[PDB]
Each structure stands twice: as structure tokens, then as C-alpha cells.
Amino acid sequence: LIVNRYEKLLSQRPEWHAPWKLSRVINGHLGWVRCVAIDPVDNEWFITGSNDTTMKVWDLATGKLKTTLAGHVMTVRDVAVSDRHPYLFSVSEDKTVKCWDLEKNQIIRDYYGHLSGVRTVSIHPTLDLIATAGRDSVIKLWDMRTRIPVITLVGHKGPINQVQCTPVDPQVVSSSTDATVRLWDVVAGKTMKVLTHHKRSVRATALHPKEFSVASACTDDIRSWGLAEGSLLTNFESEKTGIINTLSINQDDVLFAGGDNGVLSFYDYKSGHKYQSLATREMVGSLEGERSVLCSTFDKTGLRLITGEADKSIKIWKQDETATKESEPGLAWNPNLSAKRF
Amino acid sequence: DILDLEELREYQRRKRTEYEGYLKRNRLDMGQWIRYAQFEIEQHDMRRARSIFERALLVDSSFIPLWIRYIDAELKVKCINHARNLMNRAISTLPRVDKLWYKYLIVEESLNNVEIVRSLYTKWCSLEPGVNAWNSFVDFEIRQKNWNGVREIYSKYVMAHPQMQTWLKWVRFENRHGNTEFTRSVYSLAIDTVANLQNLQIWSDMEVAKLVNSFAHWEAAQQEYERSSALYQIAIEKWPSNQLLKAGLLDFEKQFNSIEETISYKRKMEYETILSNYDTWWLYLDLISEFPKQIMQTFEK
Amino acid sequence: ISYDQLAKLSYEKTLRNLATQKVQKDTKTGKITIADDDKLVNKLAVSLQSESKKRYEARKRQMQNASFINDKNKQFNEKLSRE
């Protein structure tokens, strides 16, 4: 049967996307920029959580340091502005999930409960309820108003490197180090379906905006998953690229993946076609292992990628508006077939 | 030392308390789990051993050795259905590991439930496993005296692994097989498939070259060299980039003209020579062999 | 050598150890009683014990072969020396 599928693949054509170039570089923090998150209501400013613990807010247009925020103690591993209500959630290895209010620039409510240094926060899009999960191997669910944990989605057998809150029945996509991913009947307190198509730490996951799917990463492979049924959608061509740290998808089906190699990958989300590799640069003084993109996100526009690299740099990427199907095409896509996943 | 019953009970308790305690700290030390399970086995209380294994499994499924140990423990007390059920469960959990499948297979083989081993093998092969699985299956199905249904799986073994090595292996099998008609038939099939998927959607030129060579030598053993010749012409016709192909053809010609052989082969040597840099020797060779326009053009170059 | 190969190669071996020398289903219960030869299962049990025993004694010999202080260190220096 393989030959049929392969033939079908060859028949189809992954569309051309404009490639990328390093538009802006910001040596802002004094640590790794492990978290980056961008305001989805206005597309004006984006904050980034350092290892220093001082999450700093950055205007896009200028690029300048809008303002620092330092309520945490340990590395702010993740943050998440809620477009729904003006609350910047954040989270550190100090186990706090502090909710800032940007109408005041202070912190408002802490969410105590988490046993171990929480790695990720995701706010629920259609509720006043937020999801968080860390080394505890538990994806908790906080009612914001009342600042209690409502429910605790036990299941995972190992730390839980990412999480994504969606509006549907599978309200949580929990991506763990346990070489799994879970979709949850949140109301039930049960994994509705559990995809496991990963050899290694599933340590970079992203919801697609207008598709209702979620890409996940392993050490190399980068599946993309359709979370209605709880079904696979598409294997990718990530066969030689590094350990994926972050995996932010664009609005226009332009799935990003960030390498521990340092190499910025770039995929057509629909197909899997690796339509640009880009070996990143480090700052003059750095060491060659340090060039590692540890964070990433796209704007509302989708025309600016922001990447929290370990060179203490917040690099930003434009799509080339001078590009065509002849002036910089993709990397001449070819499904390899060598006992492959495609 | 361990004389009476109640005393043995106490010993069992104490030992358990140790083992349990050590598990409590490092929930994961499968060495500690499996050791404890061995202890249970030794005690000849099977249920407790099973429980231990289950708990251990829960703690870490991915550790294959644990699974194997449990399996073999089950086998030990001739509790074969439990072993079988478990092994099925193992397969279900971790199908893409091979050793579990092989463990199952050997168990069934020793059992002499040959039908079941066929059935399971069908399943495993159906999951597009490693080539190894296919090969082992074939060996089983050859160790099984019959030579039908094997054919079908070979056909499917191409379906999962469209690799020329597969085809070649199949041909080798047919060589073992008595009826030569199918050998030629197989060759015809393979060639046809190659033709159909001509464009860049398979193996490199190498594999195809190898195939063509093999076919050519099979025919060489057989009567019809006319058809071989035709195939060669077809091959050069159907395929461009014919270094391998031409080489093979040249060899065949040499076997089975001389000027041609020296010519094309020598030219190839020049190409090879070029790749190395005896470039003078190459040019000279060309000059001698030629065509003379390409001799003087390439000479100039 | 991967655990892929070492499995199949060990599979091939124990097939040579074999080369030396019915299904009834109650679908309501789901109980698939494969009544098979009780002599062959016993022959598996004895063979499998013997295989494990052979391996068990193999370590015992290799343990009794011989810059350290205690049992573990001697081996730990042996773990360094092999490199």
C-alpha cells in the first residue's frame, strides 16, 4: 500500500510561502528569553520572560524596552496574556502562577497549588479559567475569579512540558515529556484520547489558529494533529533538525519550529514541506551551543515571528515581500521514502 | 534456618517490608522491582508476583526487560494462557519494539501452535514493521514446508518495503523454488513495476542497475539471450544516466564486441580518471579510442 | 548493534534451539480456550529455565575472574579501563 500513498503525495503540491530574514535583534534581557508571548487584542507589545525573572515588555514597531516586570523569583518559564481579559499570567520555577494586571502593572492573584516548578500556562479562550502544568506531571485548571484549583487532570506519567487550551470538547492539549500528548474531557477529568506518536519528549506544541489542530514536537519528528476526533493529520520532514524547543504556528499555515541546533526551521503547516532552514547567528561573545531558540511566537498579523533565543536576544523575523516562486523558492520538497513516515 | 511455616511467614513479611520500602523511595528502579518479583516467584506465591509485575509495568511501561521477565515468569509455572494474554497486551502497548513480538513468536513456536504464529505474523507484517520482521516471517514460512501464501507475503513484502533488496531476495527464493517459470515471471513483474514508476519516486539508479544485472544473469543461465539484449536496449532507452547500466551491459557483452567493450569501458575509465584528477593518460586514451571531435574537444578542455 | 538486531538475532538462535528436536471460543464470555499440548508447554518451561540457568552461571564464572578499595570500586575502575 505504501506506493499508492507515496504516489498521491507526489501528485500534490505544497504551496509556496515567502521566506524569512532576521529583521530585528534585541539584546534586552540578562538571561535566556525562555518565554515570549504577544498581546492578541492590539498587536502592539509583546512580553518576554527571562531567566533573570524580570519579564520585559517590548514594543514591536520601535523595538524599545517598554517596561520591565519583576514579581517572580526564579526563571519565568512561561507567560500568557489573555486577549479575553487584561490579565498577563505568568509562571516560574518558583511554582507560582502569578497573574499580573496590566491595567495596573502589578500582580493581582497568585495560584498556589503546584507541587513543582511550573513550565506552562495556557488561558482558556472562552472562559475565565486557566490551565497550568509542571514537573508535577499534572495539568491543573484554575478558576480565575475565585483563585482556586477547580480540577486536576492527572494522567501523564512524567513532566508536562506544554499545554494548550482550546474552545471545543477537548479543552486541553497536554504535551508531556512522557512521549505522549493528551486531549481531555475536562468536565469528566479524563483523557478523551491519548496520541502517543513520539519517541521522545513532546516538548513544543502549538494550536493552529484557523484549523483546529495542534502541532507537537519530539527530538526530531514534528507531527500535526487534528483534535476533533483525536486523530493524526500530518507527519513532517523534520528528519535531521535538532531538538525542538518551541513550535509557534503562523496565521497563514507557516509552522515554525525552533532548534536546539540553533537552526530556525520553517514548515508549510498543511503539508510538512521544510520550506526554509535558517542557521541563526549568536551575539559576538557567545559560545556556539548558546545559539538555541528557546522561545517563539507570531503576532496577530503573522508577518513577524519573535524568537526568544538563549543568546539573551529577542530576534524578530519578517517574510520577504520581494519574494516569488522563482526568486527564492522552497527547498525542493521530496518525500524521502527511506522506511519513512513522510 | 527457615524451618517452620509461621517463621517463614515472618521472613516473607520482613523481606516484603524491605523491598516495599526500597520501592517507595525510588518508584523507578526496575532492577529493584524485577528483583522483588523474582522474590515473589521464589516464594511460589504467583498472584503476588503478578501484582508486583503489574505495579512495575504501571510505573514504567517502556522498560522492555521488565515485560520480558514477567512473561518468562508466567511461562515458568506453565501458566501459558496468562503468558499469552500478557504478551498480547505487551504487543498492544509497544508494537513497534521487536523483541516482544519475537518473544511471542518463540513462545508459540515451542507451543507448536503454528496456525496462531502464522496469524500473528500476518498482523505484525501488516503494521509495516522493520524489514527484519518480514525476513524472520519468511524464514518461519520456509521452515514451514509449504511454498504458497509465502508468495503473497513476498508480494506484500514489496508493498511495505519497496526496496530492490526485497526483490532480489524474492528472486533468490524462487531460485530455491523448482519451477523456473515463476522466476522469469517475477523478473517480468519487477521490471514492469520499475517501468510504471519510472520517474524519480523510488530507489536510485544503483538499485535498478543491480536488478537489471541480476535479471541479465538469470537470462544468461536460461536460453533466451535475444530477450536479454532487448531488455538492455530497452533499459538504455527507458533510462538515462546509464553509467551503471552501460557498465553492466559491457560486462555482459564481454562475457557473451571487444572493441565496443574496450571503447565504452575505457571511456568510463576516463570519466573515472577525470573524477580522480593520469589525466594525460585519459586524454590520450580518448584520442586513441576515438568520436575524434569529442577527443579534440575534451582534449582542448 | 541495536536492540532491533539483537532481538531478531536472538530469535534466530532460539529457533535453532527449537530445530534441535486447536481453538475453541465462547463468544458470550469472550474466553478463547486454546487447548494445546501440555507436554510441549512443560518442554518450554524446562528449556526456558535451562536458558536462564545457563546465563545465570555465565555471570557467576565471569564474576569469578579476579587500583581500588572495595568490590564496587574495582569494577568501577574496570568501567573506566574498558574505555
Binding site: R5, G226, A228, L232, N235 | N88, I91, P95 | -
Partner: peptide, 25 residues
């Protein structure tokens, strides 16, 4: 007999877009 590891099956491996892109989820 068609029950050995009935939980697993190959169609879970099959990417449901690699065949048909623009499978509008």
C-alpha cells in the same frame, strides 16, 4: 485470528492529510 493486538492498527500511523491536502478540519 484477527484479534491478536486488536487495539493496534495501521490506520493510526497513516497521516490523514498526506493523502489529501486541504482536508479542511
Amino acid at each position: 485470528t484477527d484479534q491478536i493486538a486488536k487495539n493496534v492498527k495501521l490506520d493510526d500511523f497513516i497521516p490523514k492529510r498526506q493523502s489529501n491536502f486541504e482536508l479542511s478540519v
